[PDB]
């Protein structure tokens, strides 16, 4: 891939997301989704190996099916309303189809099976796009149709995502599958608060993106994709292990780290609506996420695993990866709890 | 939209196609033009929570124009009865019907 | 009987879908899809969309022609499967036709049928517009407005088609 | 609703079940995807034509344009899957278990 | 009176096709310094009848490995669709007056391709398969260029109605303002009809007989009839598209006379071209269309979009 | 101007088909700007009456609106009669 | 030549379009009466 | 939901202009000039009332002026007019351009006898004013009273009292 | 109706000719006569074996080009718009982007058949 071609394709991925976000017409929203899927597959196939081919095919089949259900909902909405405006849907069957269509696009459980596999099959840079940028467009549509979403359906997906994400991460030794299951679990929190306060869905989304972007950027820096490969970081870049520790604890929602904020704010919103059993269940089940974050901090930062002799050759060479924005993202990933009231800007 | 860049910049990218009461080529009106306009003008500015309740009449009529469900039920009721009366030798259609 | 023209075409429409949804050899799946495109064009034509109908037929005829070529290269086996050659294909094919027949039988037996949702079986002509005396086609004016009104739609569609060429070449350059 | 909708909606459902219930050939599933667009195209056209909403008469055309892109995208992936395993069978795409 | 009209269309077509085979054999004979049929009937006039009778009393064959239903279906589509291509032709009055006759013929011509694909495939023999996939290649070559060539011409006519092409050319043939398009259209019709130098799906010297190598007797005859009916129809369409005949509503026969002469001469030129050139290689046909005709057709399409506007010559919708 | 001529003449010898295409494509883009007739195309499209000309309710102060189709007031198509 | 003929055809189209405009008031009046008569006929049959 | 009010069959009866479309097309241009005033008032009524029942009376004056128009042609120009629409009737598209010679004969006949002048190209497509005594309809859409708008939130914007007031935060 | 009548007659005549062709001639069917043809010697393998497509990339590009015509075919109607300034710009825009896509595939050797 010619560098100019990569930029144009990369700009098209953003263009499709932006089209969804600025569109007031259901057709243009669907077009934006198609444009996004068209441009992301070549990024997935960038390295041209059988695994990347499998991931791209599994991704394409899933996203195509969601687009069909989404467009079906739009046409049903047109029959029962005669209009195309992006807003609440006027038919409950259309609401179900759109909600499920967006659930597949996000990778929410039980439409989650593709997220672990696609993420594992593609490079880290592509996985970063998949688990962060690709969340924006479906969430922005959910942010506009939520008044007509069936409450039981959306909360059922949120609960299942948190459980399935929590349990799925416990068995993983690959860093890309850990980030996939962690992503599934975090998506559950975003949609659980969606019916009550959409602002806290945006807050959780932004903070999830900052923390996920930081973790992928640190994995890219040392070119690590397994738990054991990451366990050598202490012997080359000690500073990196400390940043991984702080970021991982934040992702686990431990105060006083930034990652505690979205969980804190979502519990507040749910209790204000006399929803007590669900936030309690959610917070406890999120302890599964913390458990398999803590294993990574054990093998990465708090202990020292054995090295290999050839590691000494890497002591003589500096990191040359861009690590774009890493110093800023890690500070935002960890030291933002004192600034929590700034969430009103999202209002 | 999520980001209303269209309103901010004043450009009009897709609002033109959103409703059937908007300006059409050569002013060809849609079949339910009047019903849409009434519902859009009833609910303008007051929000969906209020509009769901205070514009049911306008919406209910508009829905009838779109899918004609009440009308077709009425015709099936009339047609079904004629079958009963024609088949019983009770009513006879006039020449023009 | 002729008043039910659109319904009769829609019955063949579903039957074509059962043809390729049962998933025999893609040679026969393509045939099923060509039929559905044909009577699908007929359905849209009978609603006043001659241009829309003929084009979906034209586009799908070229698409299945590419599919036929790809089937002989990448989706062919020694004994391509017909609807009668496989129990899973025949079972799906039979199931879809019986589910189609019964829906037809009730809606014709009663002039209404309930299949999850209420459908009126009075014939599709009853919903048509009564008056009409414009000296033009409405579909043509609406479609032709893509270039005056649909400036934004042309940009996004033109870009996507251009990117599509760039993308397919990246994907297929191993 | 009108009776045509019953069969067009049924057609979409048949292809949806067709897509979700795989066999071996990945090509067969790509046809079920083109089947769903065909029914979506037809059902959109009936609604738009019947209601006399002129400006959306271009909507079904745009629908086909982005169906062609998906089919071209799907066929491209099938080329690379076939070049790897020598068939388009979907059971070969299980490295990532 | 409409059924009689249908028979007055298709029976003469089958007679014209029968005698086109005689005219082809004679014209090629004399261009090859020989005579061609002149024994069976005076000047070979009974030769087409003898060939027709002989084929339909010859034994048909169903190959052992063939797919029966598609094997028989394919020749029926071929002849059925070939005759369907004639119903919208204004001669000067069409049998069926369509708003979109031009697009109807594009759709039917695309459908007629499958009578080649399915006959070659259903035959389940290698030479048949090779011929069938050449048909796939040939359609990919010309279909995109053919439609855009038509669109450029219709931008001067303003309509998709075939009868409006008669009105557009009332003062002058469209070949004057569009001879570059007429050139590329004429080639495209040779490719579209699998005619030499683009007779590739059959390609005698390479594929024995190509897509219909396994067909015999009557089923073979239907394919042969369909081919020659398509030759005449596409030259009528060329004559209507570029050599418009003036129509007098009170003397419609005079249109039909001048119109027929032009179509005969254009059909004669197909035979003339067959006697003159070697065959293309079928990847060279793809490059001819995509690398030469397509860039020029795209440019002329923009030119003919702009020209009516900049000259204020936009035609009417009617 | 000499470097371009060598390239231009070179492509006339190797790819005359592409030289002709770009030239025609260039004319399709430029001439509409420089043509004195392009303005009339929109006026003729404007003057074609697809719809009924709905009358206006006369209120008393419409000097330029005609009362009868043959009255002098209103747009005239004399420019088109002579075009 | 194509320019000049197509200008004439546009002039001929307007003339044709103006004839329809002249008759539209008469046809519209007939249409209104015809629709109302049909409905009134429908209404009476429905009563019995 | 009400019983649709439909007029009586006597209130709908009128003398019908029972001539073919080729007859109407032949006389359309002169008919447009001669019967403009009743026609324009009737068309103003339909696009204002939006109801065929509210315009019946003006729709009868359209026919009475059409019959009077065709009665004058019969009195003075029956034969020249009869050739002309016959020529129009022959054409499959009823084209004017195929009957220019006969159109002339009818055109100078109505000029000499009746003083009628043919409208120029573009005349019949003008938007014209029309005086009427029918009052302007006030609720032609039969709209209900619209819901009241939400009471406006206005006044002077002051800082939030004690800031965000989020848990412990003092700002 | 007329069109449906015309189509039925066309395919009815074709089917009648096939029926006559199959039931009029005297038949003598045996295995060697109906065996697959291949120049006198038995076929070597199945004709259902995969047949590689060398123009596969052109075939996919045809699907994308074959939809440009649907977008361009409305042009004769679009030329009747009042807003010709916007028209001509958008019509020329589409064709140029189609030309650019063709140039890209051409310059990147996408139209060359694989060996
Ligand atoms: C116009 C009519 C053209 C078709 C004519 C067909 C009859 C011709 C006679 C014939 O078939 O040869 C004798 C042949 C029997 O000879 P055979 O060699 O023993 O048969 C071999 C096997 O039966 C296998 O034989 P096969 O290779 O023919 O496969 C059977 C059939 C598959 O048959 C099935 O499995 C079920 C029936 C499928 C056809 C239903 C339509 C398919 C879905 C499209 C929906 C369209 C709805 C309208 O294959 C098809 O796919 C039929 C496609 C025809 C579609 C026509 C367009 C509609 O057929 C019979 O008479 C029985
Ligand atoms: C104020 C409001 C906000 C409140 C939220 C909490 C704020 C803290 C958030 C921290 C954000 C991450 C930034 C942490 C900076 C860590 C700097 C450091 O520890 O020294 C790095 C040291 C490098 O070792 P060296 O080889 O000598 O130097 C190479 C680099 N030039 O590395 C090492 O050599 C150490 C290797 C052994 C690993 C020891 C692990 C246990 C000690 C970790 C302490 C940091 C814990 C951070 C976790 C969050 C704590 C709240
Ligand atoms: C796998 C085996 C495949 C074998 C192939 C079998 C042959 C297939 C033949 C093609 C079938 C599709 C036929 C499509 C006809 C389109 C022709 C057309 O558009 O004109 C016909 C007419 C509309 O004409 P138009 O001028 O545009 O509008 C009316 C204005 N007076 O509209 C009409 O006249 C009404 C016709 C409606 C009924 C058409 C039924 C078609 C359904 C498929 C049979
Ligand atoms: C160099 C060899 C190239 C070979 C390529 C194939 C070319 C073959 C060309 C065949 C067509 C030639 C045209 C046949 C001429 C027959 C003309 C005729 O008999 O009628 C007179 C006609 C003028 O009359 P008309 O066409 O009706 O007026 C046009 C206005 N619409 O015509 C007046 O002359
Ligand atoms: C995943 C498979 C997807 C398959 C999709 C199949 C087609 C789906 C059709 C969706 C439209 C069905 O529409 C469903 O039935 C009728 C439609 O009048 C409605 O019927 C009901 O709702 C309306 C509400 O005013 C009233 O008539 C009344 O309350 C009741 O009749 C339902 O409220 C609607 O939800
Ligand atoms: C990579 C992207 C490539 C994008 C390329 C886009 C190329 C577009 C080139 C401009 C095409 C239109 O160019 C423009 O056409 C209109 C005519 O319609 C002309 O406009 C002229 O005619 C119109 C009506 O026809 C009159 O209303 C107007 O008074 C007059 O100026 C403009 O003078 C000309 O500048
Ligand atoms: C707006 C419509 C009209 C504009 C024209 C649009 C289509 C433009 C087509 C691309 C033109 C430039 O791109 C093309 O790239 C290839 C590189 O492989 C060049 O070079 C190649 O072409 C020719 C034919 O294939 C070969 O003989 C040559 O060996 C090879 O180098 C072509 O000479 C050039 O024409």
Euclidean distance between CA atoms I102 and F22, whole angstroms:
13
The reply to whether residue H146 touches residue B47, judged by beta carbons under 8 angstroms, is: no
D94 lies in some domain: no
What tokens were used for H92? Answer: 């499959």
Distance between Cα B87 and ligand 6 center (Å): 69
Rg (CA), chain B: 21
* Cα H5 to the center of its chain, rounded Å: 23
* CA-based torsion, E92, E97, E102, E107: positive or negative: negative
Cβ neighbours, 10 Å, residue B37 = 17
Where in the sequence is the domain holding C89, given as residue range(s)? Answer: 4-169
Residue recorded with tokens 């995208």: D73
- F20's CB contacts (< 8 A; 6+ apart) are E296, E299
Break chain H down into helix, strand, coil percent, rounded to 5.
50, 0, 50
Q: Which residues contact B12 (CB under 8 A, 6 or more apart)?
A: B6
Could you tell me if A302 and A246 are in contact, meaning their C-beta atoms sit under 8 angstroms apart? no
Tokens for A212, please give them: 């996920």
Measured by CA distance, the residue closest to atom 13 of ligand 5 is C117
DSSP state of A226: B
Please report the resolution in angstroms: 2.4
Helix ranges (H only) for E124-174 are: 126-157, 162-168
d(CA A278, CA A288): 16
Assess contact for A194 and A145: CB atoms under 8 A: no
Containing domain of residue D28, as a range? 3-85
Q: How many CB atoms lie within 10 A of CB H53?
A: 14
* Nearest residue on chain A to C158, alpha-carbon basis: A35
Tokens matching residue B54: 């205070």
| Chain CA centroid to CA C24, Å | 18
Residue C169, class by beta-carbon neighbours within 10 Å (0-12 exposed, 13-18 middle, 19+ buried)?
buried
Closest CA to E263 of E225, E226, E233: E233
Measure I38 CA to ligand 1 centroid, in angstroms: 26
The rounded distance, in Å, linking the Cα atoms of I48 and C79 is: 7
Bridge-based pairing of strands F56-57 and H129-130 is parallel
Measure in Å the smallest separation between the Cα of F50 and chain G Cα atoms.
7
Environment class of D1 (CB within 10 Å of its CB; exposed 0-12, middle 13-18, buried 19+):
middle
Are 3 or more Cβ–Cβ pairs between A and C shorter than 8 Å?
yes
Going along chain I from its start, the domains and CATH numbers come out as 7-107 (1.20.58.1610)
Q: Using CB atoms within 10 A of its CB, is residue A235 exposed (0-12), middle (13-18) or buried (19+)?
A: middle
The residue among E122, A164, E160 whose CA lies nearest residue C27 is E122
* D91 within a domain of the structure (yes/no): no
Question: What's the token pair of residue E133?
Answer: 């996939």
Which residues neighbour F68 within 8 Å (Cβ) at sequence distance 6 or greater? H33, H36, H37, H128
User: CA end-to-end span of chain F, whole Å?
Assistant: 42
For the record, the structure tokens of E277 come out as 């050139």
Candidates D60, H127, D52, G38; CA nearest to B34 is: D52
CA distances, A164 to each of A109, A182, E94, E220 (Å): 7, 10, 67, 63
Report the alpha-carbon distance of residue A83 to residue A70 in Å, rounded: 16
Number of structural domains chain C divides into: 1
F35: CB partners within 8 A, 6+ apart: E310, E311
I48-51, long-range: CB < 8 A, 24+ apart: I48/C76, I48/C77, I48/C78, I48/C79, I48/C80, I48/E124, I49/C76, I49/C78, I50/C72, I50/C73, I50/C74, I50/C76, I51/C72, I51/C73, I51/C76, I51/E129, I51/E130, I51/E133
Nearest CA to ligand 2 atom 10: A246
Structural tokens at position C73: 């290269």
Shortest CA distance to E168 belongs to which of F43, I72, G12?
G12
Q: Which of A12, A25, A97 should be substituted to probe chain C, the one whose Cβ sees the most C Cβ atoms within 10 Å?
A: A12
Residues 6+ apart with CB under 8 A from E187: E288, E293
SS3 call for F56 = strand
Distance F23 CA to ligand 6 centre (A): 18
The CA R_g of chain A, rounded to the nearest whole Å, is 20
Q: Specify the CATH number for the domain of residue D69.
A: 1.10.287.3510
Contact B76 C120 (CB under 8 A): yes
Instruction: Report the residue of A7, A17, A24, A45 to disrupt the C interface, i.e. the one with the largest count of C CBs within 10 Å.
Output: A45
b vs e for H92-114, b when ≥16 Cβ sit within 10 Å of the residue's Cβ? eebbbebbeebbeebbebbeeee
> Is it true that the peptide bond before G10 is cis, omega within 30 degrees of 0?
no
Of chain F residues 20-39, which have a CB less than 8 A from chain E? Answer: 20-22, 24-25, 27-29, 31-32, 35, 37-38
Answer yes or no: are the C-beta atoms of C18 and D13 closer than 8 Å.
Answer: no
Which residues, in sequence order, are bridge partners of residue D89? Answer: D25
Determine E/D contact with 3+ CB pairs under 8 A as the test.
no
Q: Which two tokens stand for residue B38?
A: 């009434």
Question: Residue C74: which CATH number?
Answer: 1.20.120.1200
From CA D19, how far away is CA C22, in angstroms rounded?
Answer: 10
Residue C98, exposed/middle/buried by CB under 10 A (0-12, 13-18, 19+)?
exposed
Nearest-Cα distance to chain F for B28, in Å, is 9
A85 by DSSP, 3-state: which? strand
Under 8 Å CB-to-CB from I91, ≥6 apart: which residues? Answer: C147, E302, E305, I72, I75, I78
- Please check whether residue H53 is in contact with residue H7, taking contact to mean a CB–CB distance below 8 angstroms: yes
Indicate contact of B with H: 3+ CB pairs under 8 A. yes
**Chain B to chain G Cβ contacts (< 8 Å):** 8
Q: Are H150 and B47 in contact (CB under 8 A)?
A: yes
D51 touches chain B (CB under 8 A): yes
DSSP strand pairing (C112-115 vs C117-120): antiparallel
CA distance A70 to A99: 8
| E2 CA to centre of own chain | 25
Chosen from I4, I15, I47 to mutate, greatest number of chain E CBs within 10 A: I47
> Exposed, middle or buried: residue A94 (CB in 10 Å: 0-12, 13-18, 19+)?
buried
Please give the biggest Cα pair distance in chain D. 51
From CA E113, how far away is CA C164, in angstroms rounded? Answer: 26
How far apart CA C50 and CA C45 sit, in angstroms, is 5
Q: What's the token pair of residue A272?
A: 């204000």
For residues H81 and D62, what is the distance between their CA atoms, to the nearest angstrom? 52
Contact (CB, 8 A) for C89 and C22: yes
What is the Cα G42 distance to its own chain's centre? 24
The token duo for A179 is 């980030």
Q: Ligand 6 centre from C121 Cα, in Å? A: 52
Residue of C8, C21, C27, C31 best suited for mutating to test ligand 1, as the one with most atoms within 8 Å of CB: C31
Put simply, whether D76 touches I (Cβ < 8 Å) is yes
**G34 at interface of B, judged by CB pairs closer than 8 A:** no
Tokens of I98: 């189609």
Q: Which residues of B touch H143 (CB under 8 A)?
A: 38, 41
| Residue whose entry in the numeric block shows the structure tokens 């929109």 | F42
- Asked if omega into D80 is within 30° of 0 (cis), the reply is no
Helix H or strand E segment including F38? helix F38-47
Q: Is F54 left (phi over 0), alpha (psi -120 to 50) or beta?
A: beta
Distance between CA atoms of A116 and A179, rounded to whole angstroms?
8
Is C174 part of any domain? no
Q: Which residue has the tokens 């969340």?
A: A135
- Using alpha carbons, list the distances in angstroms from residue B91 to B73, B86, C110, E81: 22, 5, 21, 50
Q: Six-digit token pair at I7?
A: 């189509």
DSSP state of H115: -
Q: Quick count: other Cβ atoms within 10 Å of Cβ A309?
A: 6
Question: Which residue in H73, H72, H71, H103 sits closest to H87, CA to CA?
Answer: H103
Neighbours of I112 (CB within 10 A): 15
Class of residue B95 by CB neighbours under 10 A (exposed 0-12, middle 13-18, buried 19+): exposed
Give Cβ neighbours of residue H31 (< 8 Å, ≥ 6 apart). G22, G23, H24, H66, H69
> Rounded to the nearest whole angstrom, what is the distance from the C-alpha of residue A75 to the centroid of ligand 1?
36
Residue pair E98/I7 in contact (Cβ under 8 Å)? The answer is no
Looking at the DSSP bridge assignments, the partners of residue I105 are none
Burial class (CB in 10 A: 0-12, 13-18, 19+), D17: middle
Query: Is residue C17 within 8 Å of residue C36, measured between CB atoms?
Result: yes
**C50: cis peptide before it, omega within 30°?**
no
Q: Tell me the torsion sign for CA atoms A64, A65, A67, A72.
A: positive
Number of domains in chain D: 1
- Inter-CA distances, E222 with E139, I11, I18, Å: 21, 12, 8
The DSSP bridge pattern shows strands F56-57 and C117-120 to be: unpaired
DSSP sequence for H42-104: HHHHHHHH--GGGGHHHHHHHHHHHHHHHHHHHHH-HHHHHHHHHHHHHSTT--STT-HHHHH
Ligand of minimum distance to the alpha carbon of C94: 1
Residue showing tokens 């992936």: D77
From CA H142, how far away is CA H51, in angstroms rounded?
11
Distance CA I111, CA I113 (A): 6
**Spacing, Cα I102 to ligand 7 middle (Å):** 9
DSSP structural state of residue H10: H
Mark yes or no for CB contact B93/G46 under 8 Å: no
Chain I closest-CA separation from residue C68 CA (Å): 11
- Look at residue H130 and give its three-state secondary structure: strand
From CA E7, how far away is CA A206, in angstroms rounded? 74
Residue numbers in E near F27 (CB within 8 A): 303, 306
SS (H, E, C) C100-123: HHHHHHHHHHHCEEEECEEEECCC
Residue keyed to tokens 């409905």: G39
Q: Does residue D57 come out as left (phi exceeding 0), alpha (psi in the -120 to 50 range) or beta?
A: alpha
Token pair, residue F39, equals 């303005």
Tell me, yes or no, whether C105 lies in a domain: yes
The span from the CA of E223 to the CA of E205, in Å, is 19
Looking at chain I, list the stretches that DSSP marks H as alpha helix, in order from N- to C-terminal side: 2-23, 31-34, 56-65, 68-72, 75-78, 84-107
Distances (CA, A) of D14 to A61, D6, D34: 17, 12, 12
Q: Select from D1, D63, D77 the Cβ nearest to the Cβ of A57.
A: D77
Tokens matching residue C91: 């079972």
Q: Which residue reads 């079940």 in tokens?
A: D17
Q: Is A4 helix (H, G, I), strand (E, B) or coil?
A: helix
Residue C109: count other Cβ atoms within 10 Å of its Cβ.
10
Judged by a CB distance cut-off of 8 A, whether residue D65 touches chain I is yes
Beta bridge partners of C117: C115
Decide: A247 and A218 in contact? Cβ < 8 Å.
yes
Q: Give the whole-angstrom CA distance, residue E237 versus residue E109.
A: 13
The number of C-beta contacts closer than 8 angstroms across A and C is 41
3-class DSSP assignment, residue A180: helix
Peptide bond into E197 cis (omega under 30): yes
Contact at CB, B20 and A28, closer than 8 angstroms:
no
Task: Say how many Å lie between the first and final Cα of chain G, rounded.
Answer: 67
Closest Cα partner for C111 from B69, D6, B80?
Answer: B80
Least Cα distance to H81 among H18, H16, H19 occurs for H19
Beta bridge partners of C115: C117
Q: Is the CB of F33 under 6 A from ligand 6?
A: yes
Distance from the Cα of residue H127 to its chain's centroid: 11
Q: Angle at the Cα of H56 (from H54 to H58), degrees rounded to 5?
A: 105
Distance, CA of H35 to CA of H39 (rounded, Å): 6
Which of E183, E165, E192 lies closest to E89, judged by CA? Answer: E165
Q: Hey, how many other C-beta atoms are within 10 angstroms of the C-beta on F70?
A: 18
List of chain D residues whose C-beta atoms are within 8 Å of the C-beta of residue B24: 54-55
- Whether E311 and chain G come into contact, CB under 8 Å, resolves to yes
Backbone torsions φ then ψ of D39, nearest 5 degrees: -70, -40
Residue D93 lies in a domain: no
Tell me whether residue D9 is in a domain: yes
D92, part of any domain: no
- On whether the CB atoms of residues C160 and A8 are closer than 8 A, the answer is no
β-strand partners of F56: H129
The pair phi, psi for residue A82, each rounded to 5°, is: 65, 15
- Hey, what are A19's tokens? 């089209």
First-to-last alpha carbon distance for chain C, in angstroms, is 57
H helices, E strands: number in chain H: 7, 1
Tokens of A94: 């259309």
Nearest to A145 by CA among A276, A29, A319: A29
E276: CB partners within 8 A, 6+ apart: none
């Amino acid at each position: 891939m010619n560098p100019i071609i990569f930029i144009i394709i990369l700009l098209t991925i953003m263009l499709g997301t932006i089209i969804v976000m600025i569109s007031s017409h259901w057709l243009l929203v669907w077009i934006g989704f198609e444009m996004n899927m068209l441009a992301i597959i070549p990024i997935m196939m960038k390295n041209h190996n059988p695994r990347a081919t499998e991931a791209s095919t599994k991704y394409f089949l899933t996203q195509s099916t969601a687009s069909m259900l989404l467009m079906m909902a739009v046409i049903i909405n047109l029959m029962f309303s005669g209009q195309w405006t992006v807003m609440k849907l006027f038919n409950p069957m259309a609401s179900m189809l759109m909600t499920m269509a967006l659930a597949m696009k996000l990778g929410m459980a039980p439409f989650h099976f593709w997220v672990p596999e696609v993420t594992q099959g593609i490079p880290l840079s592509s996985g970063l796009i998949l688990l962060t940028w690709q969340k924006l467009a479906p969430m922005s549509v959910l942010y506009q149709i939520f008044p007509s979403i069936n409450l039981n359906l959306i909360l059922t997906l949120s609960v299942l995502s948190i459980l399935i994400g929590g349990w799925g991460g416990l068995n993983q030794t690959q860093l890309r599958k850990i980030m996939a299951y962690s992503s599934i679990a975090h998506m559950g929190w975003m949609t659980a608060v969606l019916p009550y306060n959409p602002t806290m869905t945006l807050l959780n989304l932004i903070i999830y993106i900052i923390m996920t972007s930081t973790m992928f950027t640190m994995f890219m820096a040392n070119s690590t994709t397994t738990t054991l490969s990451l366990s050598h970081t202490w012997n080359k870049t000690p500073i990196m292990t400390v940043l991984i520790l702080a970021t991982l604890l934040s992702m686990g929602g431990l105060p006083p780290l930034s990652g505690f904020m979205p969980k804190w704010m979502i519990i507040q919103e749910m209790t204000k609506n006399n929803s007590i059993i669900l936030p309690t269940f959610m917070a406890i089940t999120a302890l599964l996420n913390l458990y398999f974050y803590m294993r990574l901090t054990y093998s990465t930062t708090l202990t020292m695993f054995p090295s290999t002799n050839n590691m000494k050759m890497k002591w003589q060479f500096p990191l040359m990866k861009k690590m774009t924005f890493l110093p800023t993202m890690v500070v935002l990933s960890t030291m933002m709890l004192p600034l929590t009231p700034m969430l009103s800007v999202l209002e | 939209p999520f980001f209303d860049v269209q309103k901010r910049l004043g450009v009009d990218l897709d609002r033109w196609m959103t409703i059937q009461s908007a300006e059409q080529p050569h002013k060809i009106p849609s079949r339910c033009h009047a019903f849409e306009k009434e519902w859009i003008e009833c609910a303008h500015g007051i929000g969906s929570i209020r509009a769901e309740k205070e514009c049911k009449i306008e919406f209910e009529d508009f829905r009838e124009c779109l899918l004609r469900q009440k009308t077709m039920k009425r015709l099936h009721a009339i047609r079904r009865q004629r079958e009963k009366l024609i088949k019983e030798g009770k009513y006879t259609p006039p020449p023009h019907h | 009987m002729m008043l039910y023209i659109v319904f009769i075409l829609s019955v063949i429409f579903v039957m074509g879908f059962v043809g390729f949804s049962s998933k025999p050899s893609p040679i026969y799946g393509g045939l099923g899809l060509i039929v559905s495109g044909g009577v699908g064009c007929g359905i849209v034509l009978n609603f006043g969309g001659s241009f829309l109908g003929l084009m979906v037929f034209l586009i799908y005829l070229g698409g299945m022609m590419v599919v036929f070529g790809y089937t002989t290269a990448m989706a062919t086996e020694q004994y391509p499967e017909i609807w009668l050659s496989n129990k899973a294909v025949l079972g799906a094919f039979v199931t879809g036709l019986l589910m189609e027949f019964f829906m037809v039988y009730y809606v014709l037996k009663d002039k209404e049928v309930e299949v999850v949702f209420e459908f009126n079986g009075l014939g599709d002509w009853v919903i048509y517009d009564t008056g009409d005396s414009g000296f033009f086609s409405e579909e043509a004016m609406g479609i032709a407005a893509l270039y005056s009104y649909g400036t934004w739609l042309v940009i996004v569609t033109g870009w996507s088609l251009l990117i599509g060429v760039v993308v397919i070449m990246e994907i297929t350059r191993g | 609703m009108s009776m045509v909708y019953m069969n067009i909606m049924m057609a979409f459902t048949v292809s949806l079940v067709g897509l979700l219930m795989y066999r071996s050939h990945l090509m067969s599933s790509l046809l079920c995807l083109e089947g769903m667009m065909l029914s979506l195209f037809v059902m959109a056209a009936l609604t738009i034509l019947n209601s006399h909403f002129t400006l959306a008469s271009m909507m079904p055309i745009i629908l086909l344009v982005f169906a062609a892109c998906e089919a071209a995208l799907g066929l491209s992936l099938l080329v690379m899957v076939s070049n790897t395993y020598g068939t388009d069978y979907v059971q070969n795409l299980n490295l990532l278990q | 009176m409409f059924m009689i009209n249908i028979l007055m269309l298709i029976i003469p077509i089958l007679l014209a096709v029968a005698f086109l085979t005689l005219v082809e054999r004679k014209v090629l004979g004399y261009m090859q310094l020989r005579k061609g049929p002149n024994v069976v009937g005076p000047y070979g006039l009974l030769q087409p009848i003898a060939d027709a009778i002989k084929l339909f009393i010859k034994e048909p064959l169903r190959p052992a490995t063939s797919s029966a239903s598609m094997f028989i279906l394919a020749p029926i589509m071929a002849l059925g669709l070939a005759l369907t291509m004639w119903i919208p032709l204004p001669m000067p009055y069409p049998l069926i007056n369509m708003n979109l006759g031009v697009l109807f013929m594009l759709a039917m011509s695309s459908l007629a391709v499958y009578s080649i694909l399915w006959s070659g495939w259903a035959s389940n023999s290698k030479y048949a398969l090779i011929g069938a996939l050449r048909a796939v290649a040939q359609t990919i070559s010309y279909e995109v260029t053919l439609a855009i060539i038509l669109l450029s011409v219709l931008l001067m006519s303003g309509s998709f109605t075939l009868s409006t092409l008669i009105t557009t050319q009332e003062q002058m043939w469209l070949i004057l303002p569009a001879w570059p398009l007429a050139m590329m259209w004429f080639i495209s019709t040779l490719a579209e009809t699998n005619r030499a130098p683009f007779d590739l799906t059959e390609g005698e010297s390479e594929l024995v007989s190509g897509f219909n190598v396994e067909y015999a007797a009557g089923p073979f005859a239907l394919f042969f009839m369909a081919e020659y009916a398509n030759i005449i129809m596409m030259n009528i369409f060329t004559a209507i598209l570029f050599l418009g005949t003036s129509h007098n509503p009170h003397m419609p026969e005079l249109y039909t006379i001048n119109f027929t002469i032009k179509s005969l001469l254009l059909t004669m030129s197909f035979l003339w071209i067959r006697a003159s050139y070697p065959r293309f290689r079928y990847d060279q046909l793809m490059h001819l269309l995509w690398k030469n005709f397509l860039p020029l057709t795209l440019a002329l399409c923009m030119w003919h979009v702009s020209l009516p506007i900049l000259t204020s010559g936009i035609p009417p919708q009617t | 101007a000499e470097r371009v001529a060598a390239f231009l003449k070179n492509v006339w010898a190797k790819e005359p088909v592409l030289v002709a295409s770009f030239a025609i494509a260039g004319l399709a883009v430029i001439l509409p700007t420089l043509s004195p007739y392009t303005k009339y195309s929109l006026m003729i499209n404007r003057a074609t009456p697809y719809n009924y000309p709905v009358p206006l309710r006369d209120d008393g102060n419409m000097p330029d609106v005609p009362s009868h189709p043959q009255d002098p007031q209103g747009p005239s198509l004399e420019w088109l009669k002579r075009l | 030549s194509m320019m000049k003929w197509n200008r004439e055809r546009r002039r001929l189209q307007i003339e044709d379009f103006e004839a329809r405009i002249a008759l539209m008031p008469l046809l519209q009046a007939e249409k209104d009466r015809r629709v109302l008569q049909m409905l009134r006929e429908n209404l009476e049959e429905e009563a019995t | 939901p009400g019983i649709v009010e439909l007029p009586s069959l006597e209130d709908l009866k009128v003398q019908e202009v029972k001539v073919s479309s080729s007859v109407l097309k032949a006389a359309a241009h002169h008919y447009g000039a001669q019967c403009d005033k009743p026609n324009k008032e009737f068309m103003l009524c339909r696009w204002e009332e939006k109801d065929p029942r509210r315009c019946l009376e003006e729709g009868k004056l359209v026919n009475q002026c059409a019959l009077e128009f065709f009665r004058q042609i019969k009195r003075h120009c029956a034969e020249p007019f009869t050739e002309y629409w016959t020529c129009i009737d022959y054409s499959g598209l009823q084209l004017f351009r195929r009957c220019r010679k006969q159109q002339a004969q009818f055109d100078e006949c109505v000029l000499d006898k009746l003083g009628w002048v043919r409208p120029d190209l573009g005349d019949l497509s003008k938007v014209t004013k029309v005086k009427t005594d029918r009052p302007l309809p006030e609720n032609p859409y039969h709209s209900r009273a619209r819901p009241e708008p939400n009471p406006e939130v206005e006044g002077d914007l002051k800082p939030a009292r004690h800031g965000s007031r989020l848990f412990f935060w003092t700002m | 109706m007329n069109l449906m009548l015309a189509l039925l007659t066309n395919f009815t005549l074709a089917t009648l000719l096939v029926i006559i062709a199959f039931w009029l001639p005297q038949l003598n069917v045996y295995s060697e006569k109906t065996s697959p043809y291949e120049c006198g010697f038995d076929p070597m393998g199945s004709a259902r074996l995969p047949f590689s497509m060398k123009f596969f990339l052109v075939a996919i590009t045809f699907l994308l080009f074959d939809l440009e015509i649907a977008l361009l075919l409305p042009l004769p109607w679009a030329s009747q718009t009042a807003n010709l300034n916007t028209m001509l710009t958008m019509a020329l825009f589409l064709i140029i982007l189609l030309a650019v896509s063709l140039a890209y595939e051409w310059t990147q050797k996408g139209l060359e058949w694989t060996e």
